[PDB]
Amino acid sequence: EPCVEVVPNITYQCMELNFYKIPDNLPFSTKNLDLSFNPLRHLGSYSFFSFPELQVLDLSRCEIQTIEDGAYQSLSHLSTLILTGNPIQSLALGAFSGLSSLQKLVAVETNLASLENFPIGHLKTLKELNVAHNLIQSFKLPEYFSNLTNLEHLDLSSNKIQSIYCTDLRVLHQMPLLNLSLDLSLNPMNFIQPGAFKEIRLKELALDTNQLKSVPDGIFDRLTSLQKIWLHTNPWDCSCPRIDYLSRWLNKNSQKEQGSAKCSGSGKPVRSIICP
Numbered sequence: 001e002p003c004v005e006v007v008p009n010i011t012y013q014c015m016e017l018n019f020y021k022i023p024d025n026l027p028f029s030t031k032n033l034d035l036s037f038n039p040l041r042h043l044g045s046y047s048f049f050s051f052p053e054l055q056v057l058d059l060s061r062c063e064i065q066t067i068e069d070g071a072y073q074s075l076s077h078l079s080t081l082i083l084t085g086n087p088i089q090s091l092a093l094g095a096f097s098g099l100s101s102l103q104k105l106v107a108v109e110t111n112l113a114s115l116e117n118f119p120i121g122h123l124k125t126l127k128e129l130n131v132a133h134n135l136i137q138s139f140k141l142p143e144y145f146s147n148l149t150n151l152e153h154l155d156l157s158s159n160k161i162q163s164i165y166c167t168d169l170r171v172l173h174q175m176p177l178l179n180l181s182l183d184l185s186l187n188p189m190n191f192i193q194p195g196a197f198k199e200i201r202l203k204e205l206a207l208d209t210n211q212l213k214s215v216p217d218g219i220f221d222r223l224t225s226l227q228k229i230w231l232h233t234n235p236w237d238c239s240c241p242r243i244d245y246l247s248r249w250l251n252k253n254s255q256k257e258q259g260s261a262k263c264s265g266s267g268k269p270v271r272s273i274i275c276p
């Protein structure tokens with residue numbers, strides 16, 4: 001057997017074994033399958049018919065360019081799907097058909113340019129979507145996000161987002177159950193429009209290591225139950241009264257600040273600024 005048997009009947013590690021096809025020699029009972037670093041290249045319909053009990057499937061760095069309709073149709077119990085580092089160029093509209101239990105979808109560095117085209121609108125069980133390290137230019141969340149009533153973590157870090165506009169979070173405003181962690185850090189973001197966050201419950205908000213010189217007055221005033229926020233490594237303009245709102249807010253909410261937002265040119269912590 002080429003794969004490593006971690007737990008008999010349950011967990012198999014098939015990493016870097018030059019598989020060009022899904023293995024057919026493993027137990028039907030398998031729950032956890034790691035196929036990372038294999039030249040899989042294309043996933044046809046019913047690729048995982050031998051693995052109906054799968055809960056976790058790792059397809060990281062498998063050179064996958066295309067995923068056909070029903071590629072994972074068999075996988076009614078899959079909770080975690082990992083597609084990190086595949087040069088995906090064709091994702092069929094029914095690519096994720098059958099994934100009735102999916103809670104975590106990891107699509108880091110999958111050549112993703114927009115959420116609009118991304119066929120995940122039927123995955124109502126989804127709790128976490130990780131699309132970090134991609135090519136997304138817009139934070140406008142598509143209408144299908146209203147289907148994702150269990151979403152609690154959205155990672156859009158290391159993308160190509162330059163702005164947050166008011167309309168961007170429109171879909172989320174109608175969703176009271178929401179308790180969302182939102183990572184928008186490591187983006188070339190230099191603009192946040194006034195009123196962009198209106199009373200959403202963002203448990204966590206990361207906007208560090210962007211290109212922000214300022215934020216609108218009152219931008220965070222309507223946030224509900226914010227627990228942690230990252231704002232550091234931005235070129236903050238600490239001239240008064242421009243920095244008045246943000247310095248006041250960070251001072252008051254200092255327990256929530258992770259890391260230290262600092263003034264461009266002086267390095268003084270933004271939370272320590274007091275305008276005359």
Ligand SMILES: *[C@@H]1O[C@H](CO[C@H]2O[C@@H](C)[C@@H](O)[C@@H](O)[C@@H]2O)[C@@H](O[C@@H]2O[C@H](CO)[C@@H](O[C@@H]3O[C@H](CO)[C@@H](O)[C@H](O)[C@@H]3O)[C@H](O)[C@H]2NC(C)=O)[C@H](O)[C@H]1NC(C)=O
Pocket residue numbers: 120121122123124144147
């Ligand atoms: C956002 O969701 C809606 C509906 O959500 C349902 O999704 C299913 C999979 C399941 O999770 C369930 O719990 C949700 O209520 C999507 O709109 C619906 O799309 C389906 C097609 O998959 C339509 O069903 C079809 O209906 C026609 C007749 O009307 C039949 O001939 C077909 O066989 C099939 O049953 C359904 O009508 C749509 N509902 C409405 C009111 O639009 C929507 O597509 C989705 N958004 C995205 C972009 O994914």
Ligand SMILES: *[C@@H]1O[C@H](CO[C@H]2O[C@@H](C)[C@@H](O)[C@@H](O)[C@@H]2O)[C@@H](O[C@@H]2O[C@H](CO)[C@@H](O)[C@H](O)[C@H]2NC(C)=O)[C@H](O)[C@H]1NC(C)=O
Pocket residue numbers: 005008009025026027028029
């Ligand atoms: C547990 O898995 C076995 C098959 O895997 C066995 O043999 C090795 C691969 C070994 O590493 C270890 O995983 C395990 O002992 C299942 O038995 C097989 O079931 C199929 C039908 O699905 C039969 O056709 C096979 O004859 C039979 N054994 C063989 C030789 O492969 C077994 O059903 C499964 N048990 C549970 C509780 O799910």
Ligand SMILES: *[C@@H]1O[C@H](CO)[C@@H](O[C@@H]2O[C@H](CO)[C@@H](O)[C@H](O)[C@H]2NC(C)=O)[C@H](O)[C@H]1NC(C)=O
Pocket residue numbers: 152178179180203
């Ligand atoms: C979002 O916040 C809500 C409100 O506190 C959390 O829901 C509660 O979670 C605790 C612990 O699991 C339970 O004791 C309460 O009964 C829950 N209340 C509800 C709404 O039924 C929720 O867990 C938070 N979400 C995240 C992702 O942390």
